[model samples]
Target: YANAYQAYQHESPAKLIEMLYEGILRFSSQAKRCIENEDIEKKIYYINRVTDIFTELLNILDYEKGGEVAVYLTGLYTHQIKVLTQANVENDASKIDLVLNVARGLLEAWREIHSDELA
Candidate 1:
């Protein structure tokens, strides 16, 4: 699973980005489960898991480092990860938007950034 996760992290050519996002979303669900169970150890474990998702996200963005939208999402993803860490610590449900909103923006930005290459 870890290898699959890492490999998906950098899969390119645009066709697989949706699968990448879906995988990350599933990882997020698992992370949330840890928190919901109030299992501090498990929560910490899954936090690290989700952190890998974002780290891989950054790596993928770096693949297109020169593009405007890619550069922006790279920075946003970095900042979003920190915001998510805080939300995890505080158990702040409201801050879930930190993930949702950023991911939503990332989806649009990814499409725009890769549209030319896709064609």
Candidate 2:
């Protein structure tokens, strides 16, 4: 199993959200390790995990923040996941970099907003 998968195998939905929040904290760090080590497989694995978690989170999005925004972000994330998948298959560093950068941004925002939830 992938590290991300193993990291949260025991979580309930509520706890899964907590795991996801913690996962975000290490998003860029893992991505960087994948890049530096030229480990495309590991990178792809984590990217897939991140995308799946995002999809699950969408079901619980804060519509108070604007349902439209959440809807749009959901689509955007889906597209990014597809591109990341293709990039992974091709081992395309440039494309993976693009996905990783976006992933990091999402993770950072998530962490910044929800950091206290896990405390």
Candidate 3:
């Protein structure tokens, strides 16, 4: 952004995943705010960004290596997208909060896994 964002490397794959989760958190929160402001267009735009991130996450998942957790995340992300879609149609901030909570919980779990490896 400020400097063209020079980042991302293959040595740390989880970092990329974590960043994606962070991105969801970022856009959804803004989407919620846009809803509060009654800015329908911005709300839709932000929601679109979050949904796109979820789509990218789903596509990159490796079910073979991810096991049951992968399937679980698949369901979670899929429904979050639905929640945001409904939020867009209904102008509902609560719906966005639901997805925010989901993203927060998943990000917390992701940090735990990274730290576990660090130890």
Candidate 4:
């Protein structure tokens, strides 16, 4: 854990964002299975973690430079948070899957855009 934190501190902003997306994917995936196992506590825990990541992403958006893209991403993150809240209340695995799909898409896009640096 300490090593991970050290690495995180040293990583570029793009890499850090990528890591957050990966974290969301990991948490949401586990959350889906937690639903299958009927583990409400674990599901809630994972969903909350995903929510935290989204909040971080939303907070970091540079409106001045990002402009329309940032606006769109803000909306997207907000919608996902709403859905995740609903999922937590209803214990809906499908809702988590929906968010997972979006997260995966974003992660893929990020990787594509930063292919040279990431590679």
Which has the greatest TM-score? 4
How far off is residue 61 in model 3, in Å? 1.0
Candidate 2 stretches greater than 4 Å from native: 1-44, 62-65, 111-119
For candidate 3, the TM-score is: 0.87
Candidate 1's C-alpha runs over 4 A off are 1-12, 62-66, 108-119
Instruction: Specify the highest-lDDT model's number.
Output: 4
Better candidate by TM-score, 2 or 4 = 4
lDDT, residue 77, candidate 3? 77
lDDT tens string, model 4, 4-118? 0111122467788888999999999998999899999888899999999999888877777666667778889999999999988988888988999999888787877778876
What's the lDDT for residue 28 in model 3?
91
Worst 10 residues of 2 by lDDT: 1-10
**lDDT for each residue of candidate 2 in 1-119, tens digit (9 for 90 to 100):** 00111111112334455566456335534654686688877776776666676666556665454446655666665777677567656666576567656656655554555566544
Tens-place lDDT per residue, model 3, 1-119, is 01212122236677788889999999999998999889988887899999999998888876766666667778887988888889999888888999999888877767776776423
The 10 consecutive residues of candidate 1 with the worst lDDT sum are: 1-10
- Candidate 1 per-residue lDDT, tens place, 1-104, comes to 00101122334556577555655566566666666677777666766766777777677654333455555556766886787688689876456545765565
Q: What is the TM-score of each predicted model, taking all chains together?
A: 0.63, 0.53, 0.87, 0.88
User: Candidate 3 — which pairs collide?
Assistant: none
- In terms of lDDT, the poorest run of 10 residues in model 4 is 1-10
Q: What total of clashing residue pairs does each candidate reach? A: 0, 0, 0, 0
Look at candidate 2 and give me any clashing residue pairs: none
